[PDB]
Amino acid sequence: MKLNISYPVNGSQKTFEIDDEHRIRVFFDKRIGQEVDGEAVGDEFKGYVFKISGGNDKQGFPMKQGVLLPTRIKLLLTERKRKSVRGAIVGPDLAVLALVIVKKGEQELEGLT
RNA sequence: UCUAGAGCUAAAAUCUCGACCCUUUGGAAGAGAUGUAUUUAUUAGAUCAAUGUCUUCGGACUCU
Protein backbone atom coordinates (compact mmCIF):
# COMPACT_ATOMS: atom_id res chain seq x y z
CA MET A 1 0.00 0.00 0.00
CA LYS A 2 0.90 3.69 -0.09
CA LEU A 3 2.19 5.76 2.82
CA ASN A 4 0.78 9.28 2.58
CA ILE A 5 3.45 10.87 4.73
CA SER A 6 3.17 14.47 5.91
CA TYR A 7 5.79 16.53 7.76
CA PRO A 8 3.96 19.47 9.35
CA VAL A 9 7.10 21.11 10.80
CA ASN A 10 7.88 22.07 7.22
CA GLY A 11 4.27 21.53 6.13
CA SER A 12 5.17 19.40 3.12
CA GLN A 13 3.63 16.02 2.33
CA LYS A 14 4.46 13.14 0.01
CA THR A 15 3.23 9.63 -0.78
CA PHE A 16 5.45 6.54 -1.11
CA GLU A 17 4.35 3.37 -2.91
CA ILE A 18 5.33 0.41 -0.72
CA ASP A 19 5.00 -3.03 -2.32
CA ASP A 20 7.17 -5.17 -0.02
CA GLU A 21 5.27 -7.16 2.59
CA HIS A 22 8.11 -7.00 5.13
CA ARG A 23 7.75 -3.21 5.15
CA ILE A 24 3.97 -3.17 5.66
CA ARG A 25 3.95 -5.90 8.35
CA VAL A 26 5.10 -3.50 11.09
CA PHE A 27 1.94 -1.41 10.63
CA PHE A 28 -0.41 -4.41 10.90
CA ASP A 29 -2.99 -4.26 13.74
CA LYS A 30 -1.61 -0.85 14.78
CA ARG A 31 -4.04 1.97 15.41
CA ILE A 32 -4.43 5.67 14.62
CA GLY A 33 -2.55 7.56 17.32
CA GLN A 34 0.10 4.92 17.98
CA GLU A 35 3.82 5.61 17.69
CA VAL A 36 5.51 3.58 14.95
CA ASP A 37 9.21 3.34 14.06
CA GLY A 38 9.82 2.82 10.36
CA GLU A 39 13.45 1.81 10.89
CA ALA A 40 12.29 -1.80 10.78
CA VAL A 41 10.27 -0.77 7.71
CA GLY A 42 13.22 0.87 5.97
CA ASP A 43 16.88 1.75 6.39
CA GLU A 44 16.33 5.26 5.01
CA PHE A 45 13.73 5.68 7.78
CA LYS A 46 16.44 5.30 10.44
CA GLY A 47 15.44 6.95 13.70
CA TYR A 48 12.06 8.13 12.42
CA VAL A 49 8.99 8.04 14.67
CA PHE A 50 5.61 7.93 12.92
CA LYS A 51 2.04 8.32 14.16
CA ILE A 52 -0.83 6.81 12.18
CA SER A 53 -3.29 9.52 11.16
CA GLY A 54 -5.84 8.23 8.65
CA GLY A 55 -6.39 7.02 5.13
CA ASN A 56 -8.80 4.88 3.15
CA ASP A 57 -9.27 1.29 2.05
CA LYS A 58 -9.54 -0.17 -1.46
CA GLN A 59 -13.18 0.99 -1.70
CA GLY A 60 -12.86 4.54 -0.34
CA PHE A 61 -14.33 3.87 3.10
CA PRO A 62 -12.05 5.66 5.59
CA MET A 63 -10.70 4.60 8.93
CA LYS A 64 -12.65 6.51 11.57
CA GLN A 65 -10.93 7.40 14.86
CA GLY A 66 -11.20 4.61 17.41
CA VAL A 67 -14.43 2.95 16.38
CA LEU A 68 -13.29 -0.74 16.50
CA LEU A 69 -13.17 -3.84 14.32
CA PRO A 70 -10.69 -3.78 11.38
CA THR A 71 -13.40 -5.15 9.05
CA ARG A 72 -16.06 -2.80 7.60
CA ILE A 73 -19.31 -1.99 9.41
CA LYS A 74 -22.23 0.39 8.90
CA LEU A 75 -22.91 3.30 11.24
CA LEU A 76 -25.59 5.92 11.85
CA LEU A 77 -23.63 8.89 10.55
CA THR A 78 -24.23 12.63 10.52
CA GLU A 79 -30.35 14.91 10.45
CA ARG A 80 -28.36 11.65 10.41
CA LYS A 81 -28.07 8.92 7.77
CA ARG A 82 -26.42 5.48 7.55
CA LYS A 83 -23.27 4.78 5.54
CA SER A 84 -20.60 2.09 5.64
CA VAL A 85 -17.60 2.66 7.91
CA ARG A 86 -14.23 0.93 7.70
CA GLY A 87 -12.78 0.32 11.14
CA ALA A 88 -10.05 2.13 13.04
CA ILE A 89 -7.44 -0.63 12.83
CA VAL A 90 -4.88 -1.22 10.08
CA GLY A 91 -5.38 -4.31 7.96
CA PRO A 92 -3.93 -5.62 4.68
CA ASP A 93 -7.02 -4.50 2.73
CA LEU A 94 -6.03 -0.84 3.03
CA ALA A 95 -5.27 0.90 -0.24
CA VAL A 96 -3.32 3.59 1.66
CA LEU A 97 -2.04 4.38 5.13
CA ALA A 98 -1.74 8.11 5.79
CA LEU A 99 0.55 8.96 8.70
CA VAL A 100 2.49 11.82 10.30
CA ILE A 101 6.13 12.16 11.39
CA VAL A 102 6.68 12.58 15.14
CA LYS A 103 10.44 12.42 15.79
CA LYS A 104 13.05 12.71 13.06
CA GLY A 105 16.16 10.51 12.95
CA GLU A 106 19.36 10.53 10.93
CA GLN A 107 18.72 10.31 7.20
CA GLU A 108 16.74 12.62 4.94
CA LEU A 109 14.03 12.47 2.27
CA GLU A 110 14.44 14.93 -0.61
CA GLY A 111 10.81 15.59 -1.48
CA LEU A 112 9.70 15.41 2.16
CA THR A 113 12.33 17.05 4.38
C1' U B 1 -23.84 16.89 -3.39
C1' C B 2 -18.23 10.07 -1.20
C1' U B 3 -13.93 10.68 1.51
C1' A B 4 -8.79 10.90 4.53
C1' G B 5 -4.77 13.43 7.05
C1' A B 6 -1.46 18.51 6.82
C1' G B 7 -0.57 23.75 7.27
C1' C B 8 -3.30 28.69 7.01
C1' U B 9 -7.23 33.37 8.66
C1' A B 10 -20.46 50.82 43.58
C1' A B 11 -22.93 54.67 41.07
C1' A B 12 -27.78 56.36 39.82
C1' A B 13 -32.56 58.56 39.70
C1' U B 14 -37.59 58.89 41.44
C1' C B 15 -41.24 58.79 45.01
C1' U B 16 -43.33 60.78 49.98
C1' C B 17 -41.82 63.57 54.73
C1' G B 18 -40.14 68.40 55.50
C1' A B 19 -36.64 72.12 59.09
C1' C B 20 -37.54 76.31 56.97
C1' C B 21 -37.99 81.31 54.03
C1' C B 22 -41.18 84.19 51.08
C1' U B 23 -44.60 86.38 49.08
C1' U B 24 -43.37 86.27 44.05
C1' U B 25 -42.22 82.68 38.70
C1' G B 26 -42.86 80.44 44.76
C1' G B 27 -37.58 76.57 46.91
C1' A B 28 -35.83 73.85 49.18
C1' A B 29 -31.68 71.36 53.07
C1' G B 30 -32.04 66.17 55.04
C1' A B 31 -35.82 62.04 56.98
C1' G B 32 -36.46 57.78 54.38
C1' A B 33 -38.32 54.33 50.55
C1' U B 34 -37.96 51.25 45.60
C1' G B 35 -34.55 44.40 40.36
C1' U B 36 -37.14 41.66 35.62
C1' A B 37 -38.85 36.95 34.13
C1' U B 38 -39.77 32.04 36.01
C1' U B 39 -41.65 28.50 40.30
C1' U B 40 -44.62 27.25 44.76
C1' A B 41 -46.66 29.18 49.38
C1' U B 42 -48.43 33.58 51.98
C1' U B 43 -51.00 39.25 51.74
C1' A B 44 -53.88 43.50 50.18
C1' G B 45 -57.04 43.72 45.56
C1' A B 46 -67.34 52.01 57.37
C1' U B 47 -68.60 56.71 55.77
C1' C B 48 -68.86 62.32 54.47
C1' A B 49 -71.04 67.11 52.40
C1' A B 50 -76.82 69.95 53.00
C1' U B 51 -79.88 70.89 49.52
C1' G B 52 -82.25 66.09 53.90
C1' U B 53 -83.59 67.08 59.11
C1' C B 54 -83.79 69.54 63.93
C1' U B 55 -83.15 73.94 66.56
C1' U B 56 -82.62 77.88 71.67
C1' C B 57 -80.70 80.63 65.45
C1' G B 58 -75.48 79.15 68.57
C1' G B 59 -75.38 74.75 66.18
C1' A B 60 -76.74 69.58 66.57
C1' C B 61 -78.28 64.83 63.36
C1' U B 62 -76.88 61.10 58.37
C1' C B 63 -83.53 58.09 60.59
C1' U B 64 -85.52 59.47 54.72
From Swiss-Prot:
There is a cross-link at residue 104 (Glycyl lysine isopeptide (Lys-Gly) (interchain with G-Cter in ubiquitin)). It is found in: Cytoplasm; Nucleus, Nucleolus. It comes from the Eukaryota. Coiled coil: none annotated. Belongs to the eukaryotic ribosomal protein eS6 family. Present with 66000 molecules/cell in log phase SD medium. Component of the small ribosomal subunit (SSU). Mature yeast ribosomes consist of a small (40S) and a large (60S) subunit. The 40S small subunit contains 1 molecule of ribosomal RNA (18S rRNA) and 33 different proteins (encoded by 57 genes). The large 60S subunit contains 3 rRNA molecules (25S, 5.8S and 5S rRNA) and 46 different proteins (encoded by 81 genes). Interacts with snoRNA U3. uS11 interacts with MPP10. Component of the ribosomal small subunit (SSU) processome composed of at least 40 protein subunits and snoRNA U3. Component of the ribosome, a large ribonucleoprotein complex responsible for the synthesis of proteins in the cell. The small ribosomal subunit (SSU) binds messenger RNAs (mRNAs) and translates the encoded message by selecting cognate aminoacyl-transfer RNA (tRNA) molecules. The large subunit (LSU) contains the ribosomal catalytic site termed the peptidyl transferase center (PTC), which catalyzes the formation of peptide bonds, thereby polymerizing the amino acids delivered by tRNAs into a polypeptide chain. This is Small ribosomal subunit protein eS6A. It comes from Saccharomyces cerevisiae (strain ATCC 204508 / S288c).
